[PDB]
């Protein structure tokens with residue numbers, strides 16, 4: 648069903664994450680972590696304190712798809728075990744902010760062709776697939792986008808609900 652998912656998404660905030668490669672999304676799915684540049688790190692930390700759920704929706708550049716979505720479970724923190732991200736050319740690990748813990752809600756893919764009817768008011772009402780890394784997605788658009796993903800029957804949202 649979709650009822651616990653809708654509960655998790657109620658009054659949530661949504662952010663588009665545009666990964667340079669599949670390897671970084673694979674690492675995030677395996678380890679339950681994400682790291683971003685300080686400009687986005689600051690936005691996500693502010694959002695984490697402001698809302699019952701902050702949802703990251705992931706898309707690998709040139710894939711034509713989203714790869715899933717996850718909920719922030721912490722603010723960013725430094726000093727963990729290093730994560731061997733595959734960084735964009737011209738970028739060192741020192742340029743990253745801290746590490747966010749995340750709980751995956753859906754690890755299934757959604758092709759952009761299925762989200763063509765959804766536009767993001769916070770990005771000039773362009774299709775929600777369009778946006779820079781860290782673009783906030785307005786509540787209604789973000790909720791409908793998440794509801795379009797195939798259900799991920801491997802995930803039990805009971806655990807996610809208790810952290811809210």
Ligand SMILES: O=S(=O)(NC1CC1)c1c[nH]cn1
Pocket residue numbers: 664665666667671682683684732733734735738743780
């Ligand atoms: O270099 S990043 O700020 N973070 C990670 C490498 C994991 C980034 C690039 N594209 C989206 N986010």
